Design a protein around this nucleic acid. Sequence first.
DNA 1: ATATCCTCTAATGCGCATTAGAGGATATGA
Lengths: 882, 767
Amino acid sequence: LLEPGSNGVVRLLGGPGTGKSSLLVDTAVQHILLTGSARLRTAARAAITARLLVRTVHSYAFAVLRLAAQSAEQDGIIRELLAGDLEDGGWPEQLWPALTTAGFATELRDLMARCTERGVDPIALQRLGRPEWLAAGRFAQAYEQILGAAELVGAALEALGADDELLDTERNRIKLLLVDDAQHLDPQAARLVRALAAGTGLTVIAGDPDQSVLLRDDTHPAITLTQSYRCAPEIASAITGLGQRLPRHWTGNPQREGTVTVRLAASTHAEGTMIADALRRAHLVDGIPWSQMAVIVRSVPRVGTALARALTAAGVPVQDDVPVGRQPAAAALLTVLDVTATGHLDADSAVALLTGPIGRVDPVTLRQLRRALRRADGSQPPRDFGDLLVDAIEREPKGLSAEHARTLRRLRAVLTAARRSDASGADPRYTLWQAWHASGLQRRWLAASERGGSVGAQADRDLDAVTTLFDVADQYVLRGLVDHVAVAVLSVHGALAGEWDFVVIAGVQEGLWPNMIPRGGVLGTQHLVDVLLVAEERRLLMAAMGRARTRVMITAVDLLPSPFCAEISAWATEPPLVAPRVLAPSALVGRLRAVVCAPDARACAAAQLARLAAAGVPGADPSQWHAMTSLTTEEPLWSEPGHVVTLSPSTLQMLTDCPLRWLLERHGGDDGRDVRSTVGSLVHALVSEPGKTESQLVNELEKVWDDLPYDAKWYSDNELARHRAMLETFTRWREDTRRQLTEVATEIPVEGIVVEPGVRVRGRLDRLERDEAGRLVVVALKTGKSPVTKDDAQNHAQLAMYQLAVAAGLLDDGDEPGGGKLVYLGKAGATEREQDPLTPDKRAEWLETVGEAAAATAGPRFVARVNNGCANCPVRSSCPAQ
Amino acid sequence: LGLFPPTDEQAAVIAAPPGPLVVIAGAGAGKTETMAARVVWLVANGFATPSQVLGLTFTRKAAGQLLRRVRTRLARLAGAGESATVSTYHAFAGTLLREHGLLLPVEPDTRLLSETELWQLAYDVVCAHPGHLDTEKTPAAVTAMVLRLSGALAEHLVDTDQLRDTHVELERLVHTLPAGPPSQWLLRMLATQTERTELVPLIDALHQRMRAEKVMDFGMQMAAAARLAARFPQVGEQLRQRFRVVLLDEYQDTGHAQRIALSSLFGGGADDGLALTAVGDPIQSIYGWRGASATNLPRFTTDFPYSDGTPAPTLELRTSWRNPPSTLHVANAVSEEARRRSVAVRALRPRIRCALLNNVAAERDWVADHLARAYHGAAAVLVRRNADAAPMAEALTARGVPVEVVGLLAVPEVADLVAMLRLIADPTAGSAVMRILTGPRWRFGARDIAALWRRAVELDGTADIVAQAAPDADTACVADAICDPGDAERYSPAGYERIVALGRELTMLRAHLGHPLPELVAEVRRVLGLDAEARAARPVAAGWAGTENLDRFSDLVSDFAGGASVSALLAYLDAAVEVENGLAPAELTVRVQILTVHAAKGLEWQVVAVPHLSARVFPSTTQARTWLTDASDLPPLLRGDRGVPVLDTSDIYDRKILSDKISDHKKSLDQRRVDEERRLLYVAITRAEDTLLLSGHHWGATESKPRGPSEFLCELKTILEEEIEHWPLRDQVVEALWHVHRGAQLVAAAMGWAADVDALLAERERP
DNA sequence: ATATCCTCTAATGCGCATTAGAGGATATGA
Ligand SMILES: Nc1ncnc2c1ncn2[C@@H]1O[C@H](COP(=O)(O)OP(=O)(O)NP(=O)(O)O)[C@@H](O)[C@H]1O
Ligand SMILES: Nc1ncnc2c1ncn2[C@@H]1O[C@H](COP(=O)(O)OP(=O)(O)NP(=O)(O)O)[C@@H](O)[C@H]1O
Ligand code: SF4
């Protein structure tokens, strides 16, 4: 039936992988076509050339349409039509609110497309009337009066049958018709093929009716095939066992030995781990190469996104998303182009260049560059870093430059090339390429992509993005240019052109694979499709299983195993795993260490760890364990005899509370300075002035309040109105007590010695005043809102150190104990908490407390007592007492 | 069919004719047991196809267990003589929105926001508000009010319009009315009422921004679904055709937005052929502040009618199954006050150790001893405050009982990944350096920390003060002394090599900052010792699982960047810490349970103890505020289900009368919360199956004066007496001072795991 | 060398507003 001398229509039927394409190519060669996919046609042409018109259905339709002459655009068109068809007053009067939405356009486009596929005229749709379909048909008929890839076959067929001479000429020009794909062909393509196969030669319609021209119901002789050539007998047995439930007999290759297995997890992580375990063991132990395994899942976004991430961590390669503009590497040149178009360097457009790939500096190098630049322009108020950056780029600062000169020189070269090349040539030929050549970002990745799997990956992706940007710029022909801009896990539908020794069918849960998710809508598209399913998904499972020839691994979790799993288990060749083993080199070391350091097999594990450590394998040697490290110093902070330590009065209530808090709050360990701190310091500075009136203080505060890092600019006015009242209440307090005390000094520096380890008090007294008795009270203005209690303010460590200094000289006065005061600006007047003067009895106790506190900062091994202030300290993650 | 013999009372519910049905009587009378056994009676006998069954439960665990029970019963019945659809309420609302999202104009592609992302969006909207708030609060403190008002509104379907006339008609009673004998206190209430209408524009702009970004919330999905159900009768007439039997479990705690969405599709008086069953009791309704619906048990007999005005039938089904006597007497006497307040139940008929210790330590010892003597010689504890859960394990672990207690970012293996990622991003976070410098890796001593700080400071009017606090101000951090250690004479010789190594490692890692976000956190974890030391710290009995949460963190990071790692993923994590209290513990595989009372609804255990029953802790009278003290409280005049009495405000002619009305209104609203607490105690008691433990303490932990036991203990003591005869706080302060070694010797002396090791060696040594 | 807070409650001095201190800053689906 397949000879050079032959006529009529013949077909070969049945069998997945049997060799339909091989038979077709053999018949084509012996007698001296169609493929159905732009990638499959390349393979067919390669096979034909190796043995010695490879087109597709849509390509053939386009070719015949072109001979007869002798997707965002359609979405935009329908969106514009919908936007126009809302001001005018035939929708069912309930779809008006949804017309402007972007979800209605896609549904309408899909309905139009499926109407086009089955060969339906707009008048035919208007004959179905359900006014939604009538309105859709009217919309379609209006759209026609206003081509795409969905109606190409229909348009080509419509152009045929009228000339009555082109069809005969084309038929006479074809001697062999080899469709090679008839199981899934649109009815328009089917009738086009039938018309093209009226008389010639031939006209092989092979296809595969088991998995949904025509095959099931037709005349002409048919050929039956039964030997699979690409499936083990066990796999075929499982497939047929599933098939004996469907509303079909074929044997596999006896020369193959196969295995179909079903696995169940206890969690999603367990499934994602045993899949990688099986893949790793298959690649390493069995020895099959990569690209022969594949993971098949119902939907990549639903499951495959997490599966790929959990699988690449185990060392199994994945062959594998963002726009061109959104890529920082491509946007690096876009920023340069924008700067060239504007002609002036901005402030926030320089940090991006200093941080992006053109010139790369880590944040610490940013701090070093900022410090080295601010050392040139020694203004008392430091200038903003962005302001100095542009000046440094333009004019070279001679004050200091050691290693930052190279980066600025490179940026100079790039900018001075781009800004001059645009004053002549066009954008794509003089802006992007000149900038790329001027930048050194071509000789680095070229010698850097060779080595390193981490830096090399970024280099490759960045180079691909740069090439794509260059291609887009070429297709765009300066302001307008900137304005314009391995194991492969894949879906079931993409799992139809693979050999795939090992196939892992992932995500076969009862909630997703038999899709109980309804497929209804507002337009009733599915009702139109059906008028004009478990058994449906079983065919998909069958097709996915049939791609594997050696091993099938059906993975699910127990999130519940579908009845398909129970059905498969009947023809398979244990409690669900909860701790699945891996072959990862970083998991063997972990398990071996966990078993060695446990409260027989220990010698074996130690031998394995020794053999691992003898060849690298980080984490194996005993010296590389974290628990085996040693303290760096273990020596006291100070040890010389006669040493004197300095205690500021503000950090004495913190040393008597938690010495570790003192050690780590100073010496770095405070994660920053809040705005409240600088506002309080500013108010203290304003109050400290001795010769300014209230209006002057308020004006000074208002003139500098603008430069404060307040988000919520409705709050930067509430704070100003509150601190104006703070200044006002300070002034009222000062005027209220003028007749009872009298100031002697303000912000007076306290410094001296109180014990001979010696203790050296140092501090800045906010306000020092004197009474009618000649004493010296001490005042510490505070801008907080919640005052301390009296029984606590009488034990305040800050004041009790200040009036401790005034005893035994120090502040150069009568050296009387005085008293103690604590004024809370903010919360009849400012609330004042008092403290009695240091009596000789209590002075000894306070000296003892100071001495005991000064001895807790001596050596290593600081104490960490739990306080009521543990909720506010930054050193909590490193605190043993938690 | 191989299970329980259904009781006579349960028989009527099991084989009731098609139509609406109510089941009552509460605490073990077989409610969920007559759900799968009623599905099978409506499947095997006939009247339905098991693809037409819909069941709804509050928590997803209950949905899963009901699905498993139903499928098992159906499979067993398949051998004697197409699967159901079981989902939670909110999941069904999401499905309904996806199917018919274009009728009511909401895009079906709408994303759903978490708590952290919602807080971030609300914070940005609040901080980007051009105007004058005239409030004494702060941003991130009025965001916690906007996010609560916008939840209450969407829960009661108020749409922000009626909120603008709340203070009016009420401020006139304090100004126009004459005194009978300002009060300086009603003005605080008025300043509170004038806050809802002040912050209405904020919750309007927030909704506008959420609409403009095609995202919504958990609390807006139900509102949208309910509006769709009420406005359009064409959706119910299709679901009623698809589904013929509908089961509503735990109907006592369903909210107002879920009450008019389940009464418009099913049982609006439309179809009498739809077998609709609702179960639940009016006594275990404990939430009151989340669903905020104390109704829906009485509003069922007139809410799902017979399509002819006949009220739907309610079946008593009274029998105590999961409660042994002498623990049911306490349950039925502690909630005997509900004979007037919430009358919908009569009683249920049938088929203990109390202690009062003088301090918390003694009570902890007593409960631990009682739970250990039943373990060493041969269960759960219900703590109302979860902050109390962790404390009571040290007095119990010392007894030797295995301890199980039930923050992703506080795990010691993940907190070292958030740091060293904060140290990489901004070298000004000093709290992320003390965690690295003093961790098990490179244990720096105190002297070397001091030397590093000295090098850091060596590296370093009224306008110069404000010149600081800028985003580009220099603050003399400690992270730029590691990269310029200076001369190696100020540090110890063993502490300079580590500093140089840290500098080189950070320099290598910071260059990988332009790489995609998910490929950076997976590289830091490669450089650090994680994924190897995480497994080495796990007992052999666990198996191979050591990187569960350390991998779920990476999955969450990849989900977030579906990203900048500096502006985002570090503000995001700090927002999640304060908002979500750690993202998600990454639950174990799975001693005595620890869980809270609110998480112990509809379950059962053998030995259950409610440990802490003193005053102010279990009744929780603290931190409760009515609608006239805080803004975000939705006055009852415009709230659904109005229990929650409304003050008449139309019978007052003097200020004294208004003050009395306000005072008694506050007292009534407080008694409401007291009744809710009593319902909580009733829920806690009935989960016994066996002996029960009740305890209370005199002296707490941080009190100047002792607190007595609560009223619950003072009532239970009377109940048991008509009990173990167990009837200057403290100044002790805990302080901490700042196998592996034995097993390392075997490894040191050394120089089916053999196959794996040789295969890995072959793989590594094959270029 | 420099400060955590909002809120409800109890004493109190010239019945009601002002000041001070104690205790908690819950429970939480999808
Ligand atoms: N005579 C033959 N000798 C050797 N190998 C053969 C022979 N015929 C077919 N094959 C092999 O069988 C396979 C042909 O599969 P194929 O032609 O793709 O079947 P199929 O119908 O396309 N199944 P599908 O991939 O789902 O479309 C190839 O691996 C061929 O090498
Ligand atoms: N006919 C029966 N025979 C024996 N035990 C039963 C019977 N019916 C119910 N039970 C048991 O009584 C208890 C009732 O619990 P369950 O059936 O889960 O409903 P429930 O606990 O009452 N739900 P809820 O009332 O909301 O707390 C379970 O332990 C059942 O196993
Ligand atoms: S949490 Fe408490 S014990 Fe730990 S460092 Fe901070 S203050 Fe000290």
